[PDB]
Symmetry: D3
Subunit: 241 residues, 6 copies
Amino acid sequence: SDVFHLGLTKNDLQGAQLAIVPGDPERVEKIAALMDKPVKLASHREFTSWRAELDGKAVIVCSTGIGGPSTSIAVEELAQLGIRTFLRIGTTGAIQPHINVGDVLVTTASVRLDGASLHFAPMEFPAVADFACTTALVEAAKSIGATTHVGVTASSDTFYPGQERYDTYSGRVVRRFKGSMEEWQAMGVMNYEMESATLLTMCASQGLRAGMVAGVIVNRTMKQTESHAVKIVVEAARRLL
Amino acid sequence: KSDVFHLGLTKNDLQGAQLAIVPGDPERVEKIAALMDKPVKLASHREFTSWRAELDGKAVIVCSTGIGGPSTSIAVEELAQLGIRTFLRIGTTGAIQPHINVGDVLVTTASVRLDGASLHFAPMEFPAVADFACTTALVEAAKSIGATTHVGVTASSDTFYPGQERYDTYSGRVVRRFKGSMEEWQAMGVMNYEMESATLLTMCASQGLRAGMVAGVIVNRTQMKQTESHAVKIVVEAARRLL
Amino acid sequence: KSDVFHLGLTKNDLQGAQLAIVPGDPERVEKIAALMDKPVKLASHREFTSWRAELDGKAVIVCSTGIGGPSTSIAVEELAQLGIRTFLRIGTTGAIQPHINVGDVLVTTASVRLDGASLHFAPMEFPAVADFACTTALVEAAKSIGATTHVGVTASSDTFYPGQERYDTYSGRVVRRFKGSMEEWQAMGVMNYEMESATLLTMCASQGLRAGMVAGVIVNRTQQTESHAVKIVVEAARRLL
Amino acid sequence: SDVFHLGLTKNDLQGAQLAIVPGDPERVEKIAALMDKPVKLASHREFTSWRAELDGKAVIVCSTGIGGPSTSIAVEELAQLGIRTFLRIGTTGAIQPHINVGDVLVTTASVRLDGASLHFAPMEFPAVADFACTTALVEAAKSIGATTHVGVTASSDTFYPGQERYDTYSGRVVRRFKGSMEEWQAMGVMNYEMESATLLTMCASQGLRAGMVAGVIVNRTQQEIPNSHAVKIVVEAARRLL
Amino acid sequence: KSDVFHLGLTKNDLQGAQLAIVPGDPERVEKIAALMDKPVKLASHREFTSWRAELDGKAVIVCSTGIGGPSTSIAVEELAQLGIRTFLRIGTTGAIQPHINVGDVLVTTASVRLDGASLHFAPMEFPAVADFACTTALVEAAKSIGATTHVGVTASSDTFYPGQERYDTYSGRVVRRFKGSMEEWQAMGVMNYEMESATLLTMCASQGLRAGMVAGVIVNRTQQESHAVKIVVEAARRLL
Amino acid sequence: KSDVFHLGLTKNDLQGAQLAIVPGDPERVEKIAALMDKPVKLASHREFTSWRAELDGKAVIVCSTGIGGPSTSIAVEELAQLGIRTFLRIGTTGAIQPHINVGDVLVTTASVRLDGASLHFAPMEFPAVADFACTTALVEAAKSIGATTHVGVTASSDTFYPGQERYDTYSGRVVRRFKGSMEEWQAMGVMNYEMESATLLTMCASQGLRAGMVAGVIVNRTQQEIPNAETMKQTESHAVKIVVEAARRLL
Ligand SMILES: O=c1ccn2c(n1)O[C@@H]1[C@H](O)[C@@H](CO)O[C@H]12
Ligand SMILES: O=c1ccn2c(n1)O[C@@H]1[C@H](O)[C@@H](CO)O[C@H]12
């Protein structure tokens, strides 16, 4: 292995320059099986990687695990192997009343409620997606005729307090996040997730292209939906090779 | 009679306009409006000079913002109060990337928040991101003109001198925060420096207003008639796709 | 033709002036200059309109700064380059203290830095403090014409609306940082709100330049003026040559 | 399931109140095997959980995955399931020249170079470990004679720039972290890892007890990347905390 | 005269002392020293009153720090310059937990840094953590002496009033940052308020010096706005 | 009897005094009081020693604050509860500007907040500015006595060592924030370093209280030579006489 965590070598990628990065390692094979010649490459910790082919071009599918920290490792090591385009596909919960389950959300930029993004750029720097990737995702969503929302996403380092969930062990939410969801809602924020701030910041600050698409599973205010998101990320990827 | 505190305009004055092209200099407002139908002057107070024109039968506003986010925040706010929901920033800029040559066009996806006004609308964590439809229209319009375009991040500074790490000043000093900052932005891929986008993009993206920005490169510190016109044609053409 | 990038001025144009009165509105430059000897127009570029006059045989400059710290930082810097060492800001303002009435004169000793430009010259810990000689001249000048004067702190905001906690706006909302802020400033003794002093005072105090500010109260939120404020700033200038 | 991610019910715990939480899901079974009646419970995403018995008391072993975000989910849902004491067992990069690979490091408190800890307490709050847990870990290491070092640990949200590793795609480190390792080193910080700040903060600020121990796999004063004593210790320590 | 700027002490004055007990009140220095052998007054400048004493045949220093991290930072630094490597702070404190009673002894593992001096030694991310050996000696000493002991986090404030959300003041107002802070600390398990541990603990932990802290409860905020001493001495005994 | 928790004073003790001179060292209190009429010691608790005296027939308080903003905040707060509305801090300091000589007098208009207590009264954006009347009284008093005066900004640090970028210490290191800071403050025109003004000026300016600050330069961080053993003594008397003279104008 040429990289410490993934257990992958440059040869394993077979020239691949684009990678689809879901958070769950169990979703890796499912995405790869949607393309040609899917082949499992490795599995270490939360990182499960597969190689497939799209229109004769090698593409990688590698899980990131939950959170910016594990995500930063996968992105960094994939970049070291040659990947220059990263497309995250995920599941999410909207915070806008009009966003229904099954809807597709394409992130233009993210509210940085994480810590890893700061390890690549100061807070003043925008966690913005790559224009081409975002365009590819929006056009792919339209292609399959999905109800799509394009906008800002709040990317939190936590699933509970950071997303202002009170049904917890302590039921306490620290001052910083007390009342935050309503704030985000009034600011037009679409949803909450836990990896985009890190992904988008480390990519945009190092000349790497990154996009983000997610299917709405729940609304604070899967099968078929996740299927949609997955089809969309694969079709978008096809336009970025 | 005016509905707002600074622009000296009434909603009636806009005639249903919902989109405004917002250059910084009031002496460029008429030139921009002149490219459209029925260009009529509306008002001028301070650095806020406004004109109304028509694009494919739809009224459009061209209003200057002045220099800086503070001045820009007043114009955008009051225009929003008059009915404007889409803002297209047009300008000329330098560049901090070697591969960007004079005459190229820059379309900004998001900005580095090196201002103060943006924080009066959203915390620093919030992205000073451009609207997707506006950015798309600008990129498409630029492409139709065959212009060499660069799409990326811009650094929006509250100062023309230290915030852009200029040492050719009275003090010849640059505060710690900005010492060595230009090479950092360059390494992060930042395309250029300008002084109003962080405020514009942040206040719009956090208030349900659509915003985008396009600029013509007139100078490159690492190394303007025609360049300005192209940018202007692009912003007007983009507005056409956003009406 | 020009020794500076924006003002359109040369050192010759100043004729040795070391003092500049800096109102925000270009429309007030001529009026202020009119109170002195041999007033003459110099230049006008963007929001920067300058005039030169004479007081007691010494050349004086009156130059507008426009609205906000960004344009103000450009005017101050370029005037400093031309030889200006003392800056006196004159303006009209809206008080936030119940007992500061319209017609009253405010002399700022220091400002609350709710701007962004000041930070491009000194870290937040540094005081946006006015120079003592300037403050003294303004106070004494105000006394000479019998104005009801208030000497103290001013809140300097990068915005006219949210930063001054105004809700009569399009969104009708004020970001967390500023929600409930006016009441706090009031309880802290802050006299008023304006938008240029934090930048002016911080950049001058941290670069060996002298600066002060006086304003006439023309309105009060907790419920001829301009001519007197102008008289005061010109009278104060005389004492600083 | 009583929780959203772990796929467990309180019954699966069998009265367990202490959880040994490694980062690597492949280390869970290895840890459970050193105890009685080891039984696999579930495996979803990066959260692999096993149950074991120590001195006749049910004990849980659950992986957290890499980083504070993943860790905060595991800790929270395990807390909802009834766990009150957490003992993290991990691997780490030493930053002091005298620390050898294989040495066991017990963390008293962590430098919060993460983001999730801020979701439980402001930066002013110390990411301090529980005294009983730290005592048990030190006492357990003393009982098996392992080379042990007790002190502060720097817990980073990244493996690369936050730990000032330059052997990367960009080869650059943001201003905030340039020269940071030398600084921590001069301050006595023993090592780098990526979960303790979050773990210790969320536990100390919510009435939960937490201990932190890790084995050295690389010495940063020499290289950025390398070419069971800590485990024995974490298990022994748990025995003292039942 | 003196090898240091403020304390007015010479290295020879310490007679080899490597541990110092540091109370806040200079008036308690003599009393604490009186609990050991051969107590000799050394100096008295500002709020820095110091005595030397002997414990199990080893020289020990008792030096007041005055109130606050700034004053404390000077005492600690200059004592370190003279050879002290272990600092045990003993103080009075106000509990913010209802189960903690007046007369109870508190041992601090780490402190909430609500001060400014700690930032002059380490950024805010760094923990104001106590030394493990020192904390252990304090806990073990508490058992020996016999006292209702509580071991946990302490909030160290740069002020006695607003920073501890006290309203019995001239203005009667508390700045935004501290409005409602006490119940926040309380919900987080913080045991008490005091004003020197954040600075002491941080500057020692980040400079290779051992520090520990114990305090006696003299009031409970959930109600109103000698053990400890015997414990710090017995603890010093275990650390010589 | 005591109306306050630390000072051990009662409003009666003040005899109507509304102004207080606040030096840092409790041993200096008696010295400053000696420049006025009928000085009498009031109390002494911890680093808080207080005396009452008469100035032009009006009661005035002299009370030490101790070192740093924390103890200073207690003294100022409790003296305020007792009725004091004006505070004049007098100190001895080390300058950081080459042109400021030993023996010179410094009057602080505002301070760089390198402390922590000031934040317990106002957020960092708020200026640690001195009251205009007090500053005017100090400047005019310096002129009456006839000293070489400098009027400007002061860096108020929570530490005597790293915060003032001193390397002659046990660890010999200075944390990142203060590394190269003295040079930055010098270029910004900061006159000196001291340890109580940020707290004192901020807590007073944000609570309707008047505060002034004057100090005598006993040493210069940029010069080689160091004042005999009478570094303070003569220079200290200079500043002391100036703060008393200034007080007379604020009664
Ligand atoms: O409330 C929700 C619902 C779903 N997600 C979320 N918040 O952020 C989560 C991570 O991206 C990932 C971790 O479960 O799933 C995203
Ligand atoms: O330098 C090091 C060495 C080891 N670890 C670390 N930093 O944090 C890492 C993750 O928890 C996990 C995967 O790297 O191992 C921990």
